[PDB]
Write an enzyme that holds these catalytic residues in place. Sequence first.
Site, short mmCIF file in Angstrom:
data_model
loop_
_atom_site.label_atom_id
_atom_site.label_comp_id
_atom_site.label_asym_id
_atom_site.label_seq_id
_atom_site.Cartn_x
_atom_site.Cartn_y
_atom_site.Cartn_z
N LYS A 1 0.78 -1.19 -0.33
CA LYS A 1 -0.04 0.17 -0.10
C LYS A 1 0.78 1.19 0.02
CE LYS A 1 -1.47 2.41 3.60
NZ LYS A 1 -1.50 3.76 3.16
N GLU B 1 11.44 0.37 9.54
CA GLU B 1 12.59 1.74 9.44
C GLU B 1 11.51 2.53 9.95
OE1 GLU B 1 15.57 -0.69 7.13
OE2 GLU B 1 15.30 1.71 7.22
N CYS C 1 16.43 7.34 6.05
CA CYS C 1 17.74 6.92 6.03
C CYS C 1 18.77 8.95 5.92
CB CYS C 1 18.75 5.95 6.11
SG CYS C 1 18.16 4.35 6.96
N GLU D 1 10.92 15.38 17.63
CA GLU D 1 10.70 15.04 15.97
C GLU D 1 10.61 16.55 15.27
OE1 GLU D 1 7.18 12.68 14.85
OE2 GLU D 1 7.73 12.46 13.27
#
Lengths: 750, 750
Positions: A173, A246, A280, A372
């Site tokens: 998806k 991840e 990453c 964040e």
Amino acid sequence: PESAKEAYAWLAEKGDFGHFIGGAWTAPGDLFATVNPATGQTLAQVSQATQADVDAAVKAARKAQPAWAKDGAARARVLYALARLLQKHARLFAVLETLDNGKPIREARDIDVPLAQRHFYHHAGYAQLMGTEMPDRAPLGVCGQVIPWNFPLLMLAWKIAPALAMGNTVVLKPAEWTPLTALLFADICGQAGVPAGVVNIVTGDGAVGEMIVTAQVDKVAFTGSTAVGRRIREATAGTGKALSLELGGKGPYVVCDDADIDSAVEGLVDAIWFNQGQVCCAGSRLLVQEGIADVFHAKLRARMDSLRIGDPLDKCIDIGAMVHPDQLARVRDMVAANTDGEVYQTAVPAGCYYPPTLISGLAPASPLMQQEIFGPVLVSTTFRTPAEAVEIANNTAYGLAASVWSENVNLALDLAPKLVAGIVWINGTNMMDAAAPFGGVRESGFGREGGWEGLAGYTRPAIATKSPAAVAAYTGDGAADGLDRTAKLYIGGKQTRPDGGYSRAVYGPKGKLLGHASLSNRKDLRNAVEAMNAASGWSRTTGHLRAQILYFIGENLSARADEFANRIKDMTGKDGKAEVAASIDRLFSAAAWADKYDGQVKGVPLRGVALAMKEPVGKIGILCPDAAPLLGLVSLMAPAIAMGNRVTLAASEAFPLAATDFYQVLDTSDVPAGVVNILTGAHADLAEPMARHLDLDAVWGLSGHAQVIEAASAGNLKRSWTGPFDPAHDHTRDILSHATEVKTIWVPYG
Amino acid sequence: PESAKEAYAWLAEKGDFGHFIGGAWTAPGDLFATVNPATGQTLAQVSQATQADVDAAVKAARKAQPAWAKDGAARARVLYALARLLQKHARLFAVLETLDNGKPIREARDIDVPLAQRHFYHHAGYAQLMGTEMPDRAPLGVCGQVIPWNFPLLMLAWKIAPALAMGNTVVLKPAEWTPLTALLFADICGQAGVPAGVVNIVTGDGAVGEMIVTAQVDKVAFTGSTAVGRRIREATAGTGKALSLELGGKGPYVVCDDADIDSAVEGLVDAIWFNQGQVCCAGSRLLVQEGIADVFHAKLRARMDSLRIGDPLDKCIDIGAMVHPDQLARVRDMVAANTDGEVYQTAVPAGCYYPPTLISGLAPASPLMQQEIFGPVLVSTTFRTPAEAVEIANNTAYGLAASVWSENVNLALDLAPKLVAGIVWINGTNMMDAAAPFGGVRESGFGREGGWEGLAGYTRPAIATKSPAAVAAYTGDGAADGLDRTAKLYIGGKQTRPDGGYSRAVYGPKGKLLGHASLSNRKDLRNAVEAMNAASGWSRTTGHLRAQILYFIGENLSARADEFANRIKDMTGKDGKAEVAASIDRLFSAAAWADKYDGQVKGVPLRGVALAMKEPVGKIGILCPDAAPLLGLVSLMAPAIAMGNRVTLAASEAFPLAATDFYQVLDTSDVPAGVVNILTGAHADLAEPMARHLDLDAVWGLSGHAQVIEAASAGNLKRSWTGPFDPAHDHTRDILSHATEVKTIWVPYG
């Protein structure tokens, strides 16, 4: 700017989209506009999948998988054909990525599409070699895959290429906001010769992602937020599914006093647009040594001013449109909530365009250095010594990628292994190649994508093993013991009383009292974790030293071999000589491996080489099976410490007295304090505390409680393994992989 | 100084020495004094072995080998026991080494004996893991081993430890001048549990070495002079023996303008005594950038003055006694024959003591920079640019070890891969570890010692293959050909006429004329070698590029699959479809491998890590079997070029027309000119010229002529492979090893 005419023609051809299931397009269903974020215009109508759709996709993926698995050479030709079609249609994929996501067309054409092509070209070869180079491995089956919006096509390649290479089929998806290049990928599968049902693409929001995660698939592979990764770990707990994650973690970018300043500045500005979403990357957390910090920041702000913001279809644009109004609001709110530092922006925010933003002058312990980060935003702090840089860099719950800048050959190669990360780039950032693995530690997740290293997570053993059934403790009359035969715990290099004070009688098969074994509790575990923390130096020892220690354990067990066989027989009624001999052999095999589990050097078509190093996981809590009272403990402990880990083992609940006899072996073999800790008692008391513990890096539960263990592991997203584990089988090489992390260091090389 | 009393007691106990054969000491025979070079005193009488002795030693080694091979875990315990005994008796081994060889006791105690111990500790683990990690490998059998006088015990460890680990038995001869630590090693084998006959030590001069080399052994492993290595290659030619050679080549030591000067100076002076005989080392050829050359030389001369010369039993001594009066004369004569440069010596030569000597001011093209160097002597030249340093460093017939000094992270890692060498040390020299392989290229020999990489040369395939028998060309009536069906050669990206002008008719199985094939000659080969020289850039391409090319060859062969099957059937009478399908598969397997044959990162208990990189061999001449007219050519060519080599193939002598049809495939696939060259004709014309050619790095002769090929290869000591090779079998992974060299780069690492 670049013409979108062919992309618009394709979208008009495809009309309203259904899903790609069983090799065919389904009827459009419950439709929602997907919108160009730079113009606000509707690009296409795309379906919200139903539970029926996900069921159908998984059913088609399952039906196709055994034929797909049979012929690896055939899969290689298909993977190669997919790469050729990505290359032939490169310009279409790139424009559609820009239209759908908002990123500058120059990045889509220069970075995204070429790396997607290469991922398929490169992984074609793994399918060709799988039978002969991985003969002990077999496909998992069906993989459910969920990917984010920041790099839609490239994220798809990172998921689909290795899954297909290893003979799996996929249900994937794309992100709700960015479905279009995944739908074009679906549309080229037929031409590439993908057999019907080997690739299935369904579209939808997070609820559709949850349907896939809980469907009858063998593997879940997810890239996205840490919070959603936790929920996925909880929802898959106890199902036997393989899982890779991840997650978050925009990386630190360390600029030493002797860095190539202008190159370091240019690498950071060229990464500002890239460093968005869960990918990453490194650059978002800037750490600059204090001697050069002012000059570096002054150069950085001016270079940021040269970034061009505007129409993402214009090949001269560097800063495109924010992906969605929700993301623009996130960045705006993040900046509004910050009161620390000095904020510099290169333009006034306007429409869908948010400007490159630098928040400098933060303190190392400032919160924004650790929270964040959204949007094209950098935050910076300073450091005085390289040791302080390491300390600041590692002071978060994350560990994904990091970058280090220094012209000195010693400094750069001395800092890189100290950073907690799966990837360290020396004098560069965001370097990617299909052969070089990438992935997280800590709350950035687990598993690796890319390289030979990425293939293990899309396979299982060709020959399945099965964990032994649990064994109830023997019972007995309950008479008092006139001799001193109460065993203790082994924590921090010494025997210790159980904090709770209780022990249970242990009886032989015919009811003879053999002795007593302590019942450990959560405080005992806490003491063992503190002892492992004090033994952190073991994780920095040489392989030669650890081998010597394991050789001593093996020799000192051998010197007591008959005594241990007699204890096993006392407890189980069965002769113990073969189990003792196997236990010695496991110790000598782990000793053998301690200095021989080599990292891998990757040739890359970029600057230099990538060193995929092996590193310890850290601190591992282990629950041993009832069966194999000695062998089960020794088989798990020995490969773990061979690789530089410290361990706390809950010995066989039914038969604890061989493990307690083993304390003297550890003492006689000069095992450093805290490196091996042993608890006895009820695993119902210990399993959830070990799996939850926020200061353990991994939990291995080989006595059951798999659902509880795997759910509790989501607290800090520690690695988990719940079997199968058959102690009669030599699992040494497989346990080495459970016991290590891959850390890929990119270094210059002529 | 250090007491020699225990060493003298042992020598008095052992009396006159015989040999160690079949686990026992034989009667002393034809005796000769072995002399302490520092005192002139006789240490012991030692035997000159007879042919009867060598025969007996090999017979005992053979008798013991199958039981020894059976249980790898048992071998690991013995190898570990040998390491423990070297450690327990470390001080005795060290004093005896000093007494026998003349080296300072501090080096024997700090370097020689600890590395010998570690070699056995480390290789014990390979015996433990051999069955499971090397399942396709089996012992060779009996190894004859010959070692030099410079590091007697350590050279013995480098030979005996891997041979024993892989289940072989050994007959080893120490150097005539330095037998004593090998005899003490023999004397501890019993206590270590070495089964009788697994280790055999015989003593003698070069004639005894020659007896061992020509005895009924499966492997010869030799360290010593290049001239003796050539003779050993000639004497073993055609015997099917495995052969490894570590030969001459004292290495270049490159000091850049930005080196850590004082550290570079100290590393060089600390290496002056070490860098003697044939050993992997660097420092003897000093290359200093011209901006710092005067300051470097001035610091070097003064640091050389601080070296203490004298009694080697004195732990403060740095420069011991020359090993033998013959060696003192060699050094004296070398210095007397030199008229170039400026000679500095720290003391007047006296007795057995020759002083550290620096000959500076040489020109890059000076002969003494390239001639063999004896004694504690350094020679130096200057360079202007790093490219000139590479050019000077590589301007010899050798290629063993090299050292590079620079504080810049780019410069050091950019120079190291350009040096022609098996070992490159960055910011150090003479770094050694049992896990890190070492060995030569060019006239420094072939094979590697140490690490996983060193084990292949002590094993063979578990399942033997057999080369197909030769096939005579079919004959026919001799009628003229009215159509143009004369095939050419393929050299340098184009078809070319044979220099000799001749071609032979090719006939089918029933005498039908099929066409004509050129008969190549030595001038054609010379043209192909020049074409490969012009294609040197192929050896610097990325793995991704070479994969793309090999994928094109495979696809373009597939597009003509029926045509090639028909040609094979025309020539052989047998359906060719299966051979064509196998040929395509070999191309796709080589394409797969092109970017996936990874180097190995070694953890070492020294500073940093050792990167055991894979590199191309260079230029390879290949003679294909008669059988498998297409598959044999493609199977050898494809893995070779996948690894970055350029090749010249002599196609199937009997059936050349499939290879000549293949020219168009190479052209259509954009194979760069000179990377693949194809000759047709009589292998009797080509085998010796290819094997002799001084500008080929390797010769693969899979059509016979093994004795001629292996003897002629001694001219430049190119690598050689004469089979077995069965084209029906997929040899791809094995050919990758034939097609690569291991180059170990030691880099800093935290």
